[PDB]
Amino acid sequence: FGVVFRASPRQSDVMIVAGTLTNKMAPALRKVYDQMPEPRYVVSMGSCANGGGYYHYSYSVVRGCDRIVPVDIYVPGCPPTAEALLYGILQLQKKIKREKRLRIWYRR
Amino acid sequence: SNLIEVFVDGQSVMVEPGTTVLQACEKVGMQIPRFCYHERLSVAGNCRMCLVEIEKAPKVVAACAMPVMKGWNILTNSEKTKKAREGVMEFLLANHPLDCPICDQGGECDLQDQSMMFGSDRSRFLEGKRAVEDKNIGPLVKTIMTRCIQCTRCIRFASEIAGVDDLGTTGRGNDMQVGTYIEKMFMSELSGNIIDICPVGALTSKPYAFTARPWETRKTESIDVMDAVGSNIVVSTRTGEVMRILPRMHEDINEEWISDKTR
Amino acid sequence: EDNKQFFGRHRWVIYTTEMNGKNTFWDVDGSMVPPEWHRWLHCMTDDP
Amino acid sequence: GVRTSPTGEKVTHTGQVYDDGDYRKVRFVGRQKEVNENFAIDLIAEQPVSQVGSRVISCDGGGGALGHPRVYINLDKETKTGTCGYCGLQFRQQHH
Amino acid sequence: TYKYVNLREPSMDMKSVTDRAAQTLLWTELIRGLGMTLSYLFREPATINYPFEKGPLSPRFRGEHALRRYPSGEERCIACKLCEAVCPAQAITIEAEPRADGSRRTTRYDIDMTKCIYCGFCQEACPVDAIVEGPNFEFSTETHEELLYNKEKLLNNGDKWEAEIAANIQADYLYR
Amino acid sequence: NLTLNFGPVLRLVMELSGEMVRKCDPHIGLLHRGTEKLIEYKTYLQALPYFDRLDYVSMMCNEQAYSLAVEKLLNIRPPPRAQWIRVLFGEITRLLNHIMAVTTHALDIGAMTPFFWMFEEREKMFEFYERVSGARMHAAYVRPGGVHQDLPLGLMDDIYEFSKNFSLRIDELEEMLTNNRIWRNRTVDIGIVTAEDALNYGFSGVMLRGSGIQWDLRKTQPYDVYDQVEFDVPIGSRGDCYDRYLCRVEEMRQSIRIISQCLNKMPPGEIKVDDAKVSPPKRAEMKTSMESLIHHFKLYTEGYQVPPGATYTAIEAPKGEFGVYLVSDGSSRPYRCKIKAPGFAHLAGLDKMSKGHMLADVVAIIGTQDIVFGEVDR
Amino acid sequence: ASATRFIQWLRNWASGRDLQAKLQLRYQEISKRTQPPPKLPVGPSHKLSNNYYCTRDGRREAMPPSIVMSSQEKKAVSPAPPIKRWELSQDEPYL
Amino acid sequence: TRPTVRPRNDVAHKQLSAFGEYVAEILPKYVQQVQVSCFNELEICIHPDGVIPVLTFLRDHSNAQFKSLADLTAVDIPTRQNRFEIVYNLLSLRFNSRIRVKTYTDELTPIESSVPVYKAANWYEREIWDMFGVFFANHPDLRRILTDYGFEGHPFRKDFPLSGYVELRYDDEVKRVVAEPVELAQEFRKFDLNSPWEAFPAYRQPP
Amino acid sequence: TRDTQLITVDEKLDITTITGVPEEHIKTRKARIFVPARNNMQSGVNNTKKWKMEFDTRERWENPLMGWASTADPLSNLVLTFSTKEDAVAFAEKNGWSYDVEERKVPKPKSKSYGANFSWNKRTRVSTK
Amino acid sequence: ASTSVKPIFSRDMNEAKRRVRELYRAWYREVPNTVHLFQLDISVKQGRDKVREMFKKNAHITDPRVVDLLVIKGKMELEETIKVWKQRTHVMRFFHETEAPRPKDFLSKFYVGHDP
Amino acid sequence: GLLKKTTGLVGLAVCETPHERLKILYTKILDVLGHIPKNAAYRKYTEQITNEKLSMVKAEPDVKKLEERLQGGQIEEVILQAENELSLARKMIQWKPWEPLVEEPPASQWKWPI
Ligand code: SF4
Ligand code: SF4
């Protein structure tokens, strides 16, 4: 689909948060989001990244990666199947297809 | 002085005359299963769930009603005792309805718990069950009498504690039914207490119907201010909301009862 | 369907060009398969 | 069925609807309020009362082991019908 | 019983020593590796043409939660809270009250699809087959709120997928 | 010495004297979730899925370790057919782990192609998982008292078809790695561990057998029906990464050997203990029997009570000895559940195995220890 | 399976093996996706007699640990007999 | 036999009982109690001063040769004077047997580090300090291992709340991740699951 | 006869400064030490044997999005089990919590006689069974 | 025997105070480096005031063992800062910059809510 | 009596004269145990097992058949365990674990369940 397997943080266009985000790890996740050239999108994969998941009530778990970074697509599952994740990526393409940056700029 | 020596599984316990096998087992920390026996009510001895073996005797004895004789060794966990319990539990559950999901007593049911602790794990009852029609006895107590196990706690409570002799058993045998026999309302300042003493969901609170399950409630021990008696209560809350009010034992104030207004 | 293709490629759907008033000539989505055909297309059954 | 309130908002089968002055109606602006159109209370009232010829009847909800726990319903009262506690089906005893 | 994986003694005869010398200088075992990747070039790839082709599943697949009905339209759920009690993630919130006709029904049934671990313990603990995990696995959203399901959403999923949920249950209830 | 806080779910604080490594300080907790504390608030059934997510490449092996621990305290015995399914899916799960271990280890050091070949085989074993449980990875299938459901009709045929062709898949992996000089230079004499040091540092699994220690809990302290299947235990001679790699490849071969016997010797009968106070009744009899409905209600609301006591139960998991120290107070919720992850002791020894190697070898040593941080952090 | 005869030879020679007998793509040997309904057996406790639970109650046979020593000529012993030495396999002693 | 009941192994039980006395006779200075469970697990309960003597004897003695430290953990029992119970699980490959050694400490009393005996104890004792707060004397490098940097408290203690006291969040004003007091959009629901009826008479504590 | 050296500390045991609890949740909280009352719906007395330590209840408010019961009290679900009243009081004193203690309420022994149901001249004669 | 308690490092408060001052000196000299390495917006004076405030909270202690743990924890906390295991967020969690001031008097607490 | 090429275990060298090493080690262990009190159980047991392993070394010149008797794996493992036993007995003199119990535990330290 044009989605390279592994890309460096300074070449990437989307960050896939695939797994539990703990407090200890949250500062380093934000540090990678801030260094990503724009346009940059974020996909939350699984319950742990979505809203805390099985470990929602843990003292060491960020209850959702969406309180550390903005999120564009939420993929539900524990884990989402490889096909359900591919549905999210293809759903992000349609979201990017509806963008109207130049049209909005022309009407300012 | 006037105490006699009896044995509970070998351990010696000194009890005063007139003590029942159920009370002697209570001193060594053993609770005999029961459905019909209540320490605040007269001894009925009809459910037969308290049958317990006595060493060197051929017949199991009803623990709630048998006064303990000197030198008796009470075998509260022998095979004969355990087999006696399973058989009685098998009979209680033969005609009982499969209403646990829709029954408000689920999670705090003596029939459930003593079935999982003292009964078999499966059924061999291949027949059809009994069904009974429901009796309306007011806007507080909801009756579903297909669940009644004919323990006669409610009858003895209304007669001895509340003083109203309106409940009883009409019929005979497997068709024996607990109720008023007429379209009568059991309204009393102590009526709501037949809900607590009923082992099963035959008598359930009507205002509380379907709203909460026992396991998810938080119990807060408080006091009642509807009268100057000062009854001790437990206030059940669920996600920040009051669900129901229950009695809290206090021998010197209210025992284990509360009036309808407090309830 | 084509049963000479290996498992997974022996059943496919060519999506409609218009569904519920939406132009799906280019924007096809996996969720457009109705439940009755969802079971067959995912090999949860052999019967269409 | 679904009956709209005096502000254009549908009332759910649980009776929930935001008052006219409630600020939580803002979440539906530009979007929709999800309401299920098939009210179970009305649908179960469209089922005819089955006429049976015995004092006691059994209901498993249909489908055998795909239904609900089999229960036995008593039909001695002629003023009302016997309602299943699980599925809501109603039964009546034929002329006795 | 056991076996040695790397306990061989290389023969030191002239022919064997020259066989290893040819391997070192002529890269025989490296070219042998290029042969394996060359063969894969001419095999049929295992890729499927998603979304036009979908990966195979089974009737037991644990997907999106859903609430079902009886053939009459009456809801199966009678507000017993066994799914709420078993849910290992505490993803289910239930409230219930006597309905207008006196039935035992829920006035709230929310599943936080972001706390759920899709374990299926809810459909096992339900005594009336009310809450199930359907076969849909494509319901990713654009916002976090869209994954907080309530009773209206869950009933709609049941009405949506009842045609496929019933056939999956019919094909698996004998293993349960 | 130059210090490198590499950072990210692994953070290595290393001091380098040029190319060499002098001190390696693994920083963990980037995936610590309080799994052990949460279990204290869950019933014994509700806690079972937590064990799928510790070593999330060997899901059903973890489930088995927790099932054996609880069954030991319950003093019950799963039926023979459940024990053959657990051994069968125990060895299917070892193939899933070793494919991940060998191929990600190869992927990290440049060999990217074997990863794809063997992940088409993993995608077919994930279908076995999804056909018996409905989940590709986290099945929750192995439970105290047996398993959850019987195998669907036609499953064992597909496992036979899979096992028939798998030995050729391993042979293709070895045509790429075993004799490849570039692969032998990256692993031979790398991370040598002496037998005495491996024992003292708490190693287990291939970390011991790669150093010649003849130990495997499937043969020394057998569980389920592992004493009824013939298989060999690979043993290394040098203690390096290459010997451990060969051990993992040979275990994948002996797993196909065990799988071949589980299929033939699969017996009939029930798949969960016929004791409705531990295992839930059948749904059909839950809807017709009063006792069966009561037990279904209690087993799913309160759970079963486990007699008081504490046990340390361990199994030969694909990554090594995986065990649980489980303390029961007599209620339906465990008092304490310590999880002994094999990779926790292995990682603690990374500072020793990496002494005197280059920076690029620390990648090879981490791969050889087969570290998944779900179990290290817990 | 659709590969021509020439390409089948080219892949087999390059790989050094007969890949056609062990294709990694499933075509028709797999099981049918619709199966006849099962009828699973019942356990050993499905009896109508001689089946009292007290005779098969595993949990109630668990006992507290037995105290061997409490602070409140003899032959030396070890925890168990020393482990027997393993034997080389006759299937394939050396890989 | 009985299909559903775990079979007993009286041979292993007898062997471990004899070996428990063997250790108790050789280390009277420290052993406080020895017991073997119904599933053939041996527990040696010792005074905390006897950690290095007892473990060294078990590791090195010819008839013990417990050369592997399978696991080292702790249990918090707030009702005891000494809250924490330190558990050493050991494996003997020579005799194909396992032994459990237990001691006790409190919040302020330290225990001698077992690193001299078993090198594996290095990270297990860091986790006990991190999660339980027990301090181990003469540990080469003692510090937090699992919790976040600057994390206050010891999570695995029985009086530590499940969700903790603080939670993380990114604040756009300060351009960093901040820590604030914990508020939950849905409070964890406490379930009272215990049955009011006794389940196991064999463990009935005397009144 | 401990070889290791020992010291003397005649001070009140206090660990409030090393437990990590915020001061807000040490000085303002009121611990309650009690034996739970029997659930009056059941006759089993197995839940009335151990001592409990809970904390005072605090505000729960509805979540605007869903109506869930939110809280800000980290100790809302904390319940501790103790063997005796002293163990609970000792534990709450070293953690700095102000506590209340309620004496155990054991039901008094009752004089039960089945033969009283059929008395000749007393009021205990029942009228039905 | 009741008070015969094994020590950690100090045998009396006099020795415990010795370790505290050594710990305080280590922290006092580290702040100017911490404010530089982590690029903190606070000043050295503010950083040292916080160091001073943290020590003042535990000034009522009279148990050497409890003081030993506080020093043990203090050294551990200092170690994380020196070696840059912490990040700017961890160093700035001593200042509570995003938490709005909470009222301390009765009337202000009375208006906001129910907490005492 | 052909010397084995390797012990199989990594880091464990092959001993060319196993019998002489065992006599020296067992002789020293019995000597160190002479400094322990006569009634100490560690002395009675360690001497008991040490003597029987010494007897089996003075009655079997064949290394292969000596291993089958001692039952400690390779003969290099027996030597290694002999070194450990010597090192422990030396430490046990300083610890003196044959003395009475240092202190009793509190009343309910080992009571479970609480
Ligand atoms: S698979 Fe499930 S448990 Fe594991 S990280 Fe993803 S959401 Fe969390
Ligand atoms: S009374 Fe008890 S056993 Fe009977 S239906 Fe209600 S909960 Fe079930």
Ligand code: SF4
């Ligand atoms: S209604 Fe309840 S209390 Fe009355 S007899 Fe029946 S079971 Fe007993």
Ligand code: SF4
């Ligand atoms: S699948 Fe499991 S976690 Fe998800 S809602 Fe159902 S019971 Fe809860």
Ligand code: SF4
């Ligand atoms: S969905 Fe099923 S288990 Fe859940 S409350 Fe409704 S009937 Fe009970």
Ligand code: FES
């Ligand atoms: S309790 Fe004794 S017969 Fe009912």
Ligand SMILES: [K+]
């Ligand atoms: K009741």
Ligand SMILES: [Zn+2]
């Ligand atoms: Zn029905």
